[PDB]
Amino acid sequence: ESADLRALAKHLYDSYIKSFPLTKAKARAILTGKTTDKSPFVIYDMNSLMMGEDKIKEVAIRIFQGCQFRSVEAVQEITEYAKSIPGFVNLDLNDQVTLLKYGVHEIIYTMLASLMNKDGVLISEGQGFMTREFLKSLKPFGDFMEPKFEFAVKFNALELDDSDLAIFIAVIILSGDRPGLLNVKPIEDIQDNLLQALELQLKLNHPESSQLFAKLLQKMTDLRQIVTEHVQLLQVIKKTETDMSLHPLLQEIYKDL
Numbered sequence: 001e002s003a004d005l006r007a008l009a010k011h012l013y014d015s016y017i018k019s020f021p022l023t024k025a026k027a028r029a030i031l032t033g034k035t036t037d038k039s040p041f042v043i044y045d046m047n048s049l050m051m052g053e054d055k056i057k058e059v060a061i062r063i064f065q066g067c068q069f070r071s072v073e074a075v076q077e078i079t080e081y082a083k084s085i086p087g088f089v090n091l092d093l094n095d096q097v098t099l100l101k102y103g104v105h106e107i108i109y110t111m112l113a114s115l116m117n118k119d120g121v122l123i124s125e126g127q128g129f130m131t132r133e134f135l136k137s138l139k140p141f142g143d144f145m146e147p148k149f150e151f152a153v154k155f156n157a158l159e160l161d162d163s164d165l166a167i168f169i170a171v172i173i174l175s176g177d178r179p180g181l182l183n184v185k186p187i188e189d190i191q192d193n194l195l196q197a198l199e200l201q202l203k204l205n206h207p208e209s210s211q212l213f214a215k216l217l218q219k220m221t222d223l224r225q226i227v228t229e230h231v232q233l234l235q236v237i238k239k240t241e242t243d244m245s246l247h248p249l250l251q252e253i254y255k256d257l
């Protein structure tokens, strides 16, 4: 019955709000000049990057490690979200590990789009904002943000809100095509449910948006290509800069094939 799927949707949106401090709703309010939320300081160049301290080593390296620390933070937020998905903590621990390993970046880049417009990305819980052009002007680092921006601009076109994203993020984790899974069937059973709940939510929440469900599912291939591209680019950056750390959490997630 649809009735159960609605309760599942409401549960998931609720733990999404509890798990992620910076929702798309707050991000969009910050980004469009709304009075619910303050203004960001904008980092468009190096001097603005320095002023960003009075009110919120090399530069491309600091920025990149910042993306790492934020990711390490998001992995925690995503992991707490995962535990709220009905059934997830009942799975074999190794499969729990495998689902997070492969799902976490796909989720990070989905939710990063929430913080993006054509021109840039919120940073530091929305206090600041750093232009897409500044990030494109950084030789090995100058291109690392561009595919995320490209996907975010297409993804934001779906006009999804947080209650839709909560379910879709859950669908991403509960994949079951992930490499190395022990018991695929109990994972697929959870996802069948999540897919029905997502399908119903999009239908109720976006009634004049034909086949939004299919188009959202199609954006999953883009996410996979962002991740696999970023892994290749991550290899390059680590060899050209032998002095750049990678957090051990991200290192473990980025298992060579």
Ligand SMILES: O=C(CCCC[C@@H]1CCSS1)NCCOc1ccc(CC2=[SH]C(=O)NC2=O)cc1
Residues within 6 Å of the ligand: 062, 063, 064, 065, 066, 067, 068, 070, 071, 072, 105, 108, 112, 121, 122, 123, 124, 130, 145, 148, 234, 250
């Ligand atoms: O840019 C910002 C914040 C800048 C930080 C502040 C600055 C400190 C000093 S100055 S400001 N947020 C959006 C950036 O988009 C990304 C891209 C990748 C990731 C996760 C990564 S990166 C990697 O190699 N592996 C990963 O899992 C996270 C965010």
